[PDB]
Amino acid sequence: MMFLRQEDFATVVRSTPLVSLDFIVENSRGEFLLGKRTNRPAQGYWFVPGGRVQKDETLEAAFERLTMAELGLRLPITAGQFYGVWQHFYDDNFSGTDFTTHFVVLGFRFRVSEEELLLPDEQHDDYRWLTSDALLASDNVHANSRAYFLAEKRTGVPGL
Amino acid sequence: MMFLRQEDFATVVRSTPLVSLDFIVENSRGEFLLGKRTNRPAQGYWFVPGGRVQKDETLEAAFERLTMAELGLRLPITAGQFYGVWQHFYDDNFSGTDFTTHFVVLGFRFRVSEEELLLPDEQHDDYRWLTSDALLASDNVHANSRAYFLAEKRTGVPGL
Ligand SMILES: Nc1nc2c(ncn2[C@@H]2O[C@H](COP(=O)(O)OP(=O)(O)O[C@H]3O[C@H](CO)[C@@H](O)[C@H](O)[C@@H]3O)[C@@H](O)[C@H]2O)c(=O)[nH]1
Ligand SMILES: Nc1nc2c(ncn2[C@@H]2O[C@H](COP(=O)(O)OP(=O)(O)O[C@H]3O[C@H](CO)[C@@H](O)[C@H](O)[C@@H]3O)[C@@H](O)[C@H]2O)c(=O)[nH]1
Ligand SMILES: [Mg+2]
Ligand SMILES: [Mg+2]
Numbered sequence: 001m002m003f004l005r006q007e008d009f010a011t012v013v014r015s016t017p018l019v020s021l022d023f024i025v026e027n028s029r030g031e032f033l034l035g036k037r038t039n040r041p042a043q044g045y046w047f048v049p050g051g052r053v054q055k056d057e058t059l060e061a062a063f064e065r066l067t068m069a070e071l072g073l074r075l076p077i078t079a080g081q082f083y084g085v086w087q088h089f090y091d092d093n094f095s096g097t098d099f100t101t102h103f104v105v106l107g108f109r110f111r112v113s114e115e116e117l118l119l120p121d122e123q124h125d126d127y128r129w130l131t132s133d134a135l136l137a138s139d140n141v142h143a144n145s146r147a148y149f150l151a152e153k154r155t156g157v158p159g160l
Numbered sequence: 161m162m163f164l165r166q167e168d169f170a171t172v173v174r175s176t177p178l179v180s181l182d183f184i185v186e187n188s189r190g191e192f193l194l195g196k197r198t199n200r201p202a203q204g205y206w207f208v209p210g211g212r213v214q215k216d217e218t219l220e221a222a223f224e225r226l227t228m229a230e231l232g233l234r235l236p237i238t239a240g241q242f243y244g245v246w247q248h249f250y251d252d253n254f255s256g257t258d259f260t261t262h263f264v265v266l267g268f269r270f271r272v273s274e275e276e277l278l279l280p281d282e283q284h285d286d287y288r289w290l291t292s293d294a295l296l297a298s299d300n301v302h303a304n305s306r307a308y309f310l311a312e313k314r315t316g317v318p319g320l
Contacts, residue, residue, distance in 0.1 A: 002176075008171065008175055011168065012175050012176045014215070015168050015195045016176060016178070016214075016215050017179050019177050019179060027269055053264070054177075055174075055260075055262055056249065059247060059318065060316075082318040082319055085242075085319075100216060104219075106318060156237075156238070159265060
């Protein structure tokens, strides 16, 4: 694996696509999990949870590390239903406005129980649950997350 | 459309997974295209054709660029049957032995006329058409390419 220093990470984001896993998480009430992005890229929006795959890390191992990191619950890849290969492009990057961010994204859908998500207490306001219709009505949910809930957008996604 | 300088590419390959498209290409005799690997990594092995997605390049555009560059035939993504998300790990890299190479791979299956491809004299023996039964028996052919034709390896692949 490899967590890069700020300088190396800058070069990578500037030079090449990142790969990420996105979690479309449903609770027992048919609502979907959303987290807020306070930093760049694309600060000021709500996103489904997810994260980046590191150098020499398998998808299987990334799924377990990322579900634990993002949701407070370690899940195996077999728990998620694969939901297509998506692409996320952003004007900015974690460090500012000098270059763009590009993700190639593997989506996964699965159900959890709200109780089992063990996150730090002070982070509980960083998340909210919305039904599909409500999340599609919100001004605040980024297009890259709205996309998972629009039939129009599913068209031509490899794996769907 | 971002081809990297040697130094930037070295940093990327060292630091992060690459994204590539692989082409499982069948002729009318049910044979599959394999190309000899002339440089590092995994030099001397035979692989199905393919190539990496560049920064800010859509999967759609990469597919057209790469089918032309690899096969001499420009094809749109819609011409390909998506064939899962695979993972390729090599001990060496394009520049030597200092670090590993990691691909996250989108496989695509399709049928062509052997006639229409841009390929050199058979005498050079830098490309071969082999049946699945032949290539599976050939230690010659890299594990990452034999995998596409193995049922056991198909299991657990997202999109398959
Ligand atoms: N220094 C350093 N920072 C990193 C590294 N990897 C990630 N980071 C930073 O650490 C934070 C946590 O990132 P992840 O959870 O791994 O990825 P992400 O950036 O949240 O990506 C997710 O959100 C995007 C929407 O904002 C999605 O587009 C993407 O698909 C994914 O869900 C992010 O700010 C990221 O920029 C690294 O190797 N080195
Ligand atoms: N300097 C530089 N070199 C590059 C860059 N992108 C690719 N290359 C190099 O140019 C050659 C062709 O690259 P691609 O055709 O894009 O990728 P590939 O290395 O052929 O990858 C294919 O083969 C692998 C097995 O060897 C497969 O694992 C992979 O999925 C794919 O089929 C390779 O030697 C690669 O190192 C770049 O941005 N900058
Ligand atoms: Mg994250
Ligand atoms: Mg190639």
